Design an enzyme around this catalytic site. Structure first.
Site, PDB file in Angstrom:
ATOM      1  N   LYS A 204     -18.427  -0.531   1.632  1.00 25.10           N
ATOM      2  CA  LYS A 204     -17.272  -1.403   1.450  1.00 25.10           C
ATOM      3  C   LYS A 204     -17.498  -2.385   0.297  1.00 25.10           C
ATOM      4  CE  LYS A 204     -13.679  -3.973   1.864  1.00 25.10           C
ATOM      5  NZ  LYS A 204     -12.310  -3.491   1.518  1.00 25.10           N
ATOM      6  N   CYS A 258     -10.868 -11.238  -1.889  1.00 25.26           N
ATOM      7  CA  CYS A 258     -11.971 -10.287  -1.908  1.00 25.26           C
ATOM      8  C   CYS A 258     -12.897 -10.169  -3.108  1.00 25.26           C
ATOM      9  CB  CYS A 258     -11.396  -8.910  -1.588  1.00 25.26           C
ATOM     10  SG  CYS A 258     -10.190  -8.975  -0.238  1.00 25.26           S
TER      11      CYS A 258
HETATM   12  C1  LIG Z   1     -11.608  -1.256  -4.513  1.00 25.93           C
HETATM   13  C2  LIG Z   1     -10.214  -1.844  -4.225  1.00 25.93           C
HETATM   14  O1  LIG Z   1      -9.231  -1.334  -4.762  1.00 25.93           O
HETATM   15  N1  LIG Z   1     -10.144  -2.960  -3.338  1.00 25.93           N
HETATM   16  C3  LIG Z   1      -8.860  -3.579  -3.008  1.00 25.93           C
HETATM   17  C4  LIG Z   1      -9.064  -5.051  -2.955  1.00 25.93           C
HETATM   18  O2  LIG Z   1      -7.700  -5.643  -2.691  1.00 25.93           O
HETATM   19  P1  LIG Z   1      -7.399  -7.151  -3.415  1.00 25.93           P
HETATM   20  O3  LIG Z   1      -6.713  -7.745  -2.235  1.00 25.93           O
HETATM   21  O4  LIG Z   1      -8.574  -7.890  -3.815  1.00 25.93           O
HETATM   22  O5  LIG Z   1      -6.348  -7.023  -4.677  1.00 25.93           O
HETATM   23  P2  LIG Z   1      -6.514  -6.434  -6.164  1.00 25.93           P
HETATM   24  O6  LIG Z   1      -5.369  -5.579  -6.558  1.00 25.93           O
HETATM   25  O7  LIG Z   1      -7.876  -5.895  -6.328  1.00 25.93           O
HETATM   26  O8  LIG Z   1      -6.414  -7.776  -6.950  1.00 25.93           O
HETATM   27  C5  LIG Z   1      -7.367  -8.810  -6.807  1.00 25.93           C
HETATM   28  C6  LIG Z   1      -7.410  -9.657  -8.074  1.00 25.93           C
HETATM   29  O9  LIG Z   1      -7.845  -8.871  -9.167  1.00 25.93           O
HETATM   30  C7  LIG Z   1      -6.895  -8.822 -10.208  1.00 25.93           C
HETATM   31  N2  LIG Z   1      -7.005  -7.545 -10.934  1.00 25.93           N
HETATM   32  C8  LIG Z   1      -6.830  -6.342 -10.310  1.00 25.93           C
HETATM   33  C9  LIG Z   1      -6.931  -5.110 -10.959  1.00 25.93           C
HETATM   34  C10 LIG Z   1      -7.242  -5.133 -12.341  1.00 25.93           C
HETATM   35  O10 LIG Z   1      -7.342  -4.058 -12.947  1.00 25.93           O
HETATM   36  N3  LIG Z   1      -7.407  -6.334 -12.934  1.00 25.93           N
HETATM   37  C11 LIG Z   1      -7.312  -7.534 -12.326  1.00 25.93           C
HETATM   38  O11 LIG Z   1      -7.488  -8.567 -12.949  1.00 25.93           O
HETATM   39  C12 LIG Z   1      -5.579  -9.192  -9.534  1.00 25.93           C
HETATM   40  O12 LIG Z   1      -4.634  -9.717 -10.423  1.00 25.93           O
HETATM   41  C13 LIG Z   1      -6.026 -10.179  -8.467  1.00 25.93           C
HETATM   42  O13 LIG Z   1      -6.158 -11.479  -8.985  1.00 25.93           O
HETATM   43  O14 LIG Z   1      -9.805  -5.548  -1.837  1.00 25.93           O
HETATM   44  C14 LIG Z   1      -9.254  -5.147  -0.532  1.00 25.93           C
HETATM   45  C15 LIG Z   1     -10.044  -5.838   0.553  1.00 25.93           C
HETATM   46  O15 LIG Z   1     -11.403  -5.833   0.370  1.00 25.93           O
HETATM   47  O16 LIG Z   1      -9.221  -6.314   1.540  1.00 25.93           O
HETATM   48  C16 LIG Z   1      -9.334  -3.618  -0.491  1.00 25.93           C
HETATM   49  O17 LIG Z   1      -8.955  -3.108   0.738  1.00 25.93           O
HETATM   50  C17 LIG Z   1      -8.461  -3.034  -1.621  1.00 25.93           C
HETATM   51  O18 LIG Z   1      -8.588  -1.620  -1.563  1.00 25.93           O
END
Ligand SMILES: CC(=O)N[C@@H]1[C@@H](OP(=O)(O)OP(=O)(O)OC[C@H]2O[C@@H](n3ccc(=O)[nH]c3=O)[C@H](O)[C@@H]2O)O[C@H](C(=O)O)[C@@H](O)[C@@H]1O
Ligand SMILES: CC(=O)N[C@@H]1[C@@H](OP(=O)(O)OP(=O)(O)OC[C@H]2O[C@@H](n3ccc(=O)[nH]c3=O)[C@H](O)[C@@H]2O)O[C@H](C(=O)O)[C@@H](O)[C@@H]1O
Lengths: 418, 418
Positions: A204, A258
């Site tokens: 995870k 996360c």
């Molecule tokens: C590996 C993965 O894709 N993990 C996901 C992640 O969800 P999370 O809630 O953190 O959202 P996110 O889309 O990653 O965005 C988080 C942050 O990252 C930013 N973000 C996201 C993708 C990207 O290419 N660049 C970027 O800057 C977003 O704007 C945001 O500020 O964490 C979740 C969790 O751990 O609950 C998990 O279930 C999700 O699958």
């Protein structure tokens, strides 16, 4: 069969609803009496597509009941813990998890299956199993069972992904994993892989660290794009047509519950590392400052005194489409520039800022900083907006601006083409 | 049309062959007289699926001719440079490219199209266009055209990817890109995206840097797995079932003609960076030493004095299935342990090592180090072969070993489960 879900956050509530809609009599528990009251009214306290529709369904079916009283959990066959696991300084904060474990110990009976959904450092599940044994006098794998079933759902697509995502279940004992698998099979159509607790825990964390590190690499490409006269977003789209490449998206920062902390959870108990995960974190953590640098470079270009500048920050949520500001890079950005400029205005269609509308927040402003990629900002008439500004300056940190607005001083993270 | 291909390496020759079988008259040029002789009868000086059958076809039909005489290049409408671009110390070595460019200048005519396929630092194509102008007196975009057409093919499936891979073409001039597109559309079925030269150059480098950095991340996961009691390879397989996760493969090292130097080409002229790309390279570069660390640890466990140990290294090529040892981590590993061990033996089914068979190389050996994931090693009866060894020790650097062999002291990069 009865299932108890402890922690009705944006993942816990949907989890409880999904099980309640899949044949199980579920009792959702949350120490926050305020959250329980709201959920009872058929309306969730969080925004997630289909959550209200699905919540009312299970409440009417009589399959889901929510409460803030531990006593109501007595008689549950399964206990699923979905509490938060943020950092406590530089260390993982496992206090919420321990509190939930102790609550389960109070009402648990022989034969119970305890599932920890919360993201945790490797070794945590086994430690909590040992704690349960010490508080109950029972033995895991014989009298009760413990497993770790970390989530993979993406906020905004939770109910769909709950069903379609493949997932991992790590049992402290093999039987724990087997018992848990049968439970999730009630709605999971993706594959379910069984392993041990520590492997599931590390997997995870590895998923999220992979994501965080890749965003950091994307941000370094953004820095390089400026020097090579390249539009990094264009370069990434092009690069991603390669059969083995999927570069992530750079921007003003990485927020949410996360990515800002899971990499630290992974390193928390490690006595040795290389430092790549650490530098990736530092890179993402420094992007709000990167954006600040673009802002001041633009203000200087327009011969605007910072001490008299009025800045309009568009977006407060940590990502587009949500009202959540947890660890939002927009908030960090405001913190960085507040004492360097005369006024910092904010506007977010989902979160109450200093101003309640775009037109109002930019009126007489010297510069706009796009901090969140909300849908509203994708169809803005910058031409009309610019006419009401004192100075036409836009600093894009979310790839919202494609072709720069005419007559505007424009700067964007990774926009070396302008 | 008459197309001239300069540099008949594993990318140049296949490229020439593809054009020759796509309605074009092609002349392959290469300074190496020995290579040419082999080509025109001795089919392919390199090993690649279908290259011999395809080569004879184009040579027999008279659509392809190869030579080492610059004179034969006269009358060509298009010039495609596919020469090498390795490092020279810390600097990109563009001497081979400049040579090819100067050769083209001596035989090109007005209206010529010049394509640089070679992987290069951003800004290189523009500089070469300027050089061509100064040498010929012509103007790019008017009298002749220049474009960069980076490759994305994977050795072992070149002809397949040459056709189906989507590719990028960046022109110094818009007309150059359009002309090049019509040219490649002769055999490319994948999508062809047009952009400017610098963007194409950076995109190619970003592709390979993405891969390199992700391998380094995997290597850090491997280090952590040792501390958390996890089989990193199993963890990666599990993690990769996540919809947004595709962690790369860790191991003894990163070799080949590209990943070891392309990240450096990307950073070569950058005045500022963040450090992730740089530190990732350093991490991958020290994996042979990481493997050495596991070896010495195992010898100590077996109470064996390294100075008297006989080591059997299995694999010399930089990756399984090939005879190519370019920048092979296996060679780096041998160099690292050479003066610490009494005898270092080597065996590779594709490249002749010190011994001609696995049976002979392990006979009387104290330890086996798997440095390349060759097909042969995937079915080995380790327990059986171990009967002839002086000590039963295996250090796996390529996840060739799944379940540890019975009775062996086993160590593997990222194998914290043993
Ligand atoms: C590996 C993965 O894709 N993990 C996901 C992640 O969800 P999370 O809630 O953190 O959202 P996110 O889309 O990653 O965005 C988080 C942050 O990252 C930013 N973000 C996201 C993708 C990207 O290419 N660049 C970027 O800057 C977003 O704007 C945001 O500020 O964490 C979740 C969790 O751990 O609950 C998990 O279930 C999700 O699958
Ligand atoms: C982004 C990408 O997939 N780039 C490919 C790469 O081909 P390359 O010839 O370098 O082979 P490779 O499979 O990357 O292997 C290179 C080295 O890296 C190692 N390797 C590879 C993948 C991995 O997960 N872990 C790992 O350690 C290999 O064992 C080998 O030692 O470089 C090629 C090139 O630039 O010629 C390019 O066209 C290919 O598409």
């Amino acid at each position: 069969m009865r299932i108890a879900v402890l922690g009705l956050g944006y993942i816990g509530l949907p989890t409880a609803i999904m099980f309640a809609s899949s044949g199980y009599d579920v009792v959702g528990y949350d120490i926050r009496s305020e959250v329980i009251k709201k959920i009872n009214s058929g309306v969730a306290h969080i925004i997630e597509p289909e959550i209200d529709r699905r919540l009312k369904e299970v409440l009417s079916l009589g399959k889901l009941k929510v409460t803030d009283r531990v006593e109501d959990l007595k008689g549950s066959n399964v206990f699923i813990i979905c509490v938060q696991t943020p950092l406590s300084g530089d260390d993982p904060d496992l206090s919420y998890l321990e509190r939930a474990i102790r609550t389960v110990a109070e009402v648990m009976d022989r034969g119970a299956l305890v599932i920890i959904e919360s993201t945790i450092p490797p070794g945590t599940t086994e430690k909590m199993a040992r704690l349960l044994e010490n508080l109950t006098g029972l033995r895991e794998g014989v009298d009760f069972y413990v497993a770790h079933a970390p989530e993979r759902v993406m906020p905004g697509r939770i109910f769909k992904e709950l069903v379609y995502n493949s997932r991992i279940i790590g049992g402290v004992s093999e039987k724990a994993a087997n018992l848990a698998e049968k439970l999730y099979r009630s709605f999971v159509k993706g594959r379910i892989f069984l392993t041990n607790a520590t492997t599931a825990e590390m997997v995870k964390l590895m998923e999220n660290t992979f994501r965080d590190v890749n965003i950091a690499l994307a941000n370094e490409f953004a820095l390089l794009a400026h020097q090579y006269g390249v539009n990094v977003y264009e370069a990434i789209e092009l690069a991603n047509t390669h059969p083995r490449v999927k570069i992530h998206t750079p921007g003003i920062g990485v927020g949410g519950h996360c990515l800002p902390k899971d990499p630290y959870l992974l390193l928390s108990n490690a006595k040795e590392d290389f430092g790549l995960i650490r530098i990736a974190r530092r890179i993402n953590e420094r992007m709000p400052a990167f954006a600040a640098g673009l802002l001041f470079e633009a203000l200087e270009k327009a011969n605007i005194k910072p001490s008299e500048a009025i800045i309009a920050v568009l977006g407060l949520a940590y990502k587009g489409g949500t009202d959540d500001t947890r660890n939002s890079p927009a908030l960090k950005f405001v913190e960085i520039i507040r004492n360097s400029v005369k006024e910092v205005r904010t506007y977010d269609p989902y979160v109450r800022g200093t101003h309640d509308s775009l037109e109002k927040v930019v009126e007489g402003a010297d510069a706009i900083v796009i901090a969140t990629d909300h849908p509203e900002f994708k169809s803005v008439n910058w031409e009309s907006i610019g006419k009401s500004m004192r100075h036409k300056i836009i600093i894009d940190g979310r790839n919202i601006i494609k072709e720069p607005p005419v007559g505007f001083i424009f700067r964007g993270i990774g926009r070396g083409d302008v």
